[PDB]
Every structure is written in C-alpha cells, then in structure tokens.
Amino acid sequence: QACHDSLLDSVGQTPMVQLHQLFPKHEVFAKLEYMNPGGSMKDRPAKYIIEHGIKHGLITENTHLIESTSGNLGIALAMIAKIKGLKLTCVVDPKISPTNLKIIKSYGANVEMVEEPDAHGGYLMTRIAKVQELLATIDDAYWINQFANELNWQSHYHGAGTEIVETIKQPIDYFVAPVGTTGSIMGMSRKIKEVHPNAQIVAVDAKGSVIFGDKPINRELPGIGASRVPEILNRSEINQVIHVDDYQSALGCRKLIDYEGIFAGGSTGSIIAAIEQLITSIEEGATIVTILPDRGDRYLDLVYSDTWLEKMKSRQ
Amino acid sequence: QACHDSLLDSVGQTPMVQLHQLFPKHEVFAKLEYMNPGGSMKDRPAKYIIEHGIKHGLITENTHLIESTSGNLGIALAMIAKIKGLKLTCVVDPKISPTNLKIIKSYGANVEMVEEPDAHGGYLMTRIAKVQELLATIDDAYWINQFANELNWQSHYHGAGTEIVETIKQPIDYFVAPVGTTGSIMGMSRKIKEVHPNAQIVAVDAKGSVIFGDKPINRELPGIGASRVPEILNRSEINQVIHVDDYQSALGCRKLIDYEGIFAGGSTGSIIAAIEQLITSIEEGATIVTILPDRGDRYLDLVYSDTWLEKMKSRQ
Ligand SMILES: *Cc1c(COP(=O)(O)O)cnc(C)c1O
Ligand SMILES: *Cc1c(COP(=O)(O)O)cnc(C)c1O
Ligand SMILES: [K+]
Ligand SMILES: [K+]
Ligand SMILES: [K+]
Ligand SMILES: [K+]
Ligand SMILES: [Mg+2]
Ligand SMILES: [Mg+2]
Ligand SMILES: [Mg+2]
Ligand SMILES: [Mg+2]
Ligand SMILES: [Mg+2]
Ligand SMILES: [Mg+2]
C-alpha cells in the first residue's frame, strides 16, 4: 500500500463481498459503498462533481456550494468542501436526522433550516424555493442539483460502476440498485452493460416514492425514494422495478446483519428484501450484483429500533 | 481488487495519509484505523483473539465470549462474534454511550448492565465482579480479558504494526499512540522497532488516567485512559509520556477536521494535541507515525458538541 496525500485518495476502491450465507443458491455480490471514508456512497458524486467544477473553472476557492439535502449527500459535500477549502450551505428541513445534522455542522458547513411547510405539510417546495433564494443572493455559487446534474450519474459510471466490471468479470445476470436521484443505477448500469450487455437492470424503490409513479404514502427512510421524478432518470434503461415498504426494508437490514455481520442502512435492507423477491423468479445460480450505500449507524432510531420496527409492521 | 468471502477479509490494510496541512514542517503519517469495517481499531484484536482461540481449540461454536467493555471493543467483538456464530455478553455500566449500546444490541450481543456502583461511585469494581460471576455461571466461556491478554498486543503487532513498516520504510523518528489497554502501543512499537530500532516510542494518555500514575480526575473520553495499570504494559518500552486533558483532545479533533477534513474520535484529538506538543521539542522535518483509532460519529455529544467543549474548557 502507498501513502495518500489526502483523505480524497481513499474515496472508492471499496470492498466487494459475496453473501454466501444470506443467498446460498445464487452468487450475490455486494459492493460496500458504505466503506467510503465519509461513510456513504455519496462520497462518489461529492468528490466527482466538485473536482469537475474546479477543473473546468466553474468552481474556484471563492465559489459557495449550495444543495438541498438529506443527511448523506450533505455529509459527503461537507467533507469534500472542507478538504477543498470551499464554503457550503446545506438547505435542510426539520425531518433531517438530528445526528446527521450535527455531523454536517462538525464539518463546518453552513445550514439553512427551512421552517415553513407548504399548506399541505411537506417541506419539499420550501426547500426548492430556499435553494433558489440562496442562488439569487449568494454571489458566486454552484448548485449541486443532484436530481438533474449529469455529473451525478457520471460519478457512479466512473466510480463503483467501473470497479464492479473490473472485479465481477463473470457475466452479471442482474444488477440491483436502490433509487433516489437514480444517479447510481443510471451510471453503474451504463458501465456494467458495456461489458455485460445482457445484464438485467433492477431498480428498487420505497413504497410511496413517486420516481416510478407509486401512490404517495408517508416514507420513513432517506436515500431510497423521492418526492420528484429525477431528471437524471431514463426509464428505458430500467428492466424491472420492485417496491418495498419500510417494514420489509428494516427486516432486510436485520437479516443481513444476522446472516453476514454487515451492519448497513435502510436502503440496503430494501435491496435485501428486493433480492429475496427477485430470486423467487430467476434461475438458481444466477450472478447478482448490488450496492450497499451507507451504514447502520445512521439508523439506530429507525431500522434498528425495535419500537420503530413494530410501528412499521403496523403500517402494513 | 478481488472478492471477499466475508466482511472479515476487509479488516486491516487501512489507508495511511500524510497530514500536510496540519503539520507543514514535519512528515506526519496517520494510519486510519477507524476505516476498519466495524468502525474502529478494535476490529484488529476482536478478529485476532477470536480466530486464535478457535484455531487452538479454546473457542468452539458453543463457547460464550465474555468481556467488560466500553463501546468500541464491544462493537468489534459483537461483529466478529456474529460472523463466527458465537454468543457474546458485554458487561457494561451506565456511563456507556447510548448509541454505542444500541450498536452492540443491533449486532445481537447480550448486554449485562451493572447498576450498583461501589460506595465511591465507580462501576469498575462492579464490572470486574460481574465478569467473574458470568465466568462462574456460564459454562464454556472465554474471557477476552483485554487488559491482560497477550493476543491483544499481538493483534496490533501483526496488524497495523506490520502495515506501518511495510508502508513507512523510511526511518520512523517518532511513533505516537494513545493508550488504554496499551495493546496498540506495545504491539505496534515492537514491530516498528524491528525495522527502525531508533524509533522513539511516545505514549499519549488522558489526564487523570492511572496507566502512568497521573492523579485521578473525572475523565470524559473512552478508549484513551484507564482506571487500572494494564498487565500488557511494559513501561521500559515507552520513551516519552504526554498527558492531554479533554479540552485539549477536543480542540485537536476540531483542528484535524478543519485542516484535513478527517472526522475522528476523542483519542485522535489527544494525539493531535500531543504531536503539537512534541514538535516544540524535536527536529524540523522529522518523520512521525501515528494511529487514528475511531470516527467522530461516536462523539457528537462529546468533542463535537459546542456546549460540551465549553464545559471542558471550564475544567482546565
Ligand atoms: C443516495 C442514496 C441512495 C440512492 O442513490 P441515488 O444515486 O441517489 O439513486 C440510496 N441509499 C442511500 C443511503 C443513499 O444515500
Ligand atoms: C482502544 C482504543 C484506544 C487505545 O488502544 P489500546 O490498544 O487499548 O491501548 C484509543 N482510542 C480508542 C478510540 C480506542 O477504542
Ligand atoms: K433544489
Ligand atoms: K425528494
Ligand atoms: K474484567
Ligand atoms: K479502565
Ligand atoms: Mg458457493
Ligand atoms: Mg462574494
Ligand atoms: Mg470514485
Ligand atoms: Mg512537503
Ligand atoms: Mg452450555
Ligand atoms: Mg488485522
């Protein structure tokens, strides 16, 4: 191993682990994106978007980064911004995890907490409006714009997507990924299908997410699911869509830690639930590749709380 | 990169990063032990002790692991126990981090919380007694015994110690490590001095820790510092001892994240404070190697709480 000159050099090249115990009749490979130094998969677009902007003169040391975020992208941006010497303001709402908020603040990022919900309860439109307000009033700014920025999916194309095809050189029969912005499934599937053109691309979403037009219900988990259809998404590149509810997702997390000792976050539970559904239809022995976006540490009062689990069971 | 057959294969081979910004006049290399898959340096002894016991027939699938622990070793043991199919009971007290406790429980470990303090307030003697009670009543048990188990320092000798000398082949002028059980500084210094016999070995402890006979005061940080002199410790192998108080440690954490974007735990702050003291005495340009045991995520209500920081400032 060589010395890194900064923490940036340890982004990527994350482990790939076969889930022998959880999936004894298929060859299931899990890309451990949560082992990125910032703690989640969002290290990939944070590093890639900011470095691209700097290289091409859109971002200088004077440029103020702006984004509306839940925890994970906020934390990743804050880490990269801090390393690069850039100001960052995260637009957030009162639904953000209290611990994720403290982490963002620890990295020295500014936080703009919106307080007014719309007449109907959501803070989405309020956050959208606050981002535009900041772009109007903070001179020299760069909007990360994760739902529309092509650099998002490109980061995953060059990131785990490239590492997946280097490692899993055997045919990939199914690639299974959770969706939020869809940057991950778009970028990784594009890279995968260059090498494995017959790979089936399987999106996993939360029940109540509007990405693929499910009927909206209250959703507890971050990361997976969205309240908008992302501009990034090209539906024709998706071959199968599986929705999983929050109880299902949480059971998936608890099963993964029980069977493999892997302590992962909500959306990882979602893809465990979805792969268990998928394997009732596909061929025994299939090669399945998936990604595990973040750690269980960010879900102690969600998935890994027994009282929360019982409440989600009741929602079914 | 190759596929791992389990999470165990991703223990170790952690990044080494030069701290160019924080230490512009010395060559300071930080071993990122917090990037172990379980989240801290304690992955090393947990894996090594348990695998050694299994190899040598002291531990079978029926053997119940016992240890009195604060968070980090408890979490690491729980992860390894879960992967190996072993029962684990952690003896803990009410001072344990609420979040670390939830993490231990998430990994399916049993928890024995002691409630009676001694007449003088500490739970140390109560925990010591509870461990012996469990060893008496739980047939087929294995006491991890971290303060006395030679496998503790051996794990660090074979672990980061070996990786440090492989990577830092240039002369190591100073090796700086925090002490708790002293397994890390004993094992790593032993390996380092095989290659670099003139390396000076610098222990960093918390003010109020009795490891090197400081006057006891109330201590806020886990990991670094102890309320016993560890059997593992051989003082003759220590060349310099620096004590740092909790305010100093916390300023070190905040400076490290501000200068390098590295979000590390309390004892990392301790060794930043200690290295800043050390460099007032040593030669410019010296090569210093250190270890960063855990992440800032476990210190949001400690080091990274502004109100907590002000309270520690008042303790000086
Ligand atoms: C970002 C994220 C996702 C979804 O990834 P996208 O690239 O936005 O589709 C899933 N889970 C977690 C935890 C995430 O942070
Ligand atoms: C265990 C630990 C230490 C001290 O290491 P020892 O090998 O026990 O001396 C320091 N910091 C943290 C966070 C630890 O968990
Ligand atoms: K927006
Ligand atoms: K959304
Ligand atoms: K004990
Ligand atoms: K102690
Ligand atoms: Mg097999
Ligand atoms: Mg300006
Ligand atoms: Mg990358
Ligand atoms: Mg230099
Ligand atoms: Mg028995
Ligand atoms: Mg090791």
From Swiss-Prot, chains A, B:
The modification N6-(pyridoxal phosphate)lysine is found at residue 42. Coiled coil: none annotated. The keyword Membrane does not apply. Pyridoxal 5'-phosphate binds at residues 72, 180-184, 267. It catalyses: O-phospho-L-serine + L-glutamate = N-[(2S)-2-amino-2-carboxyethyl]-L-glutamate + phosphate + H(+). Induction: Up-regulated under iron-deficient growth conditions. Repressed by Fur under iron-rich growth conditions. It is an enzyme of class 2 (transferase). The keyword Transferase applies. It holds the Pfam family PALP. CDD domains: CBS_like. Its cofactor is pyridoxal 5'-phosphate. Homodimer. Belongs to the cysteine synthase/cystathionine beta-synthase family. SbnA subfamily. Catalyzes the synthesis of N-((2S)-2-amino-2-carboxyethyl)-L-glutamate (ACEGA) from O-phospho-L-serine and L-glutamate. This is N-(2-amino-2-carboxyethyl)-L-glutamate synthase. The lineage of its organism: Bacteria, Bacillati, Bacillota, Bacilli, Bacillales.
